Amino acid sequence: LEVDGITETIGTTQSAMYGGASAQILQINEDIKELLDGLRAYFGYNMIGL
């Protein structure tokens, strides 16, 4: 935006391919996967006879 000799330009993280918070979400997933895979080892797999 340019008015009367003062101008400003901004480029957001928003894009057609990815949303503005997509970086935070994708890092949250990276942590949750590690966090969840490790915790499953505390409980272990499920077994039932047949």
């Binding site: 008015v3 009367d4 000799g5 003062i6």
Partner: protein
């Protein structure tokens, strides 16, 4: 000792200015985003000192 002598000096003084004209005097914005209501803000003046 210097009753009828001349004297000369190299001197340092503070910078000073006066406003001799106000130029592009007012610039305005109705800022509304992330406000309870429309607000009027005066953007910077340019001064010819």
């Amino acid at each position: 000792k210097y009753e009828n002598h001349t004297v000369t000096l190299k001197i340092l003084m503070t910078l000073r200015y006066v406003v001799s004209d106000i130029l592009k005097e007012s610039r305005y914005q109705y800022t509304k985003f992330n406000q309870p209501k429309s607000k009027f803000e005066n953007l910077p003046q340019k001064l010819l000192l």
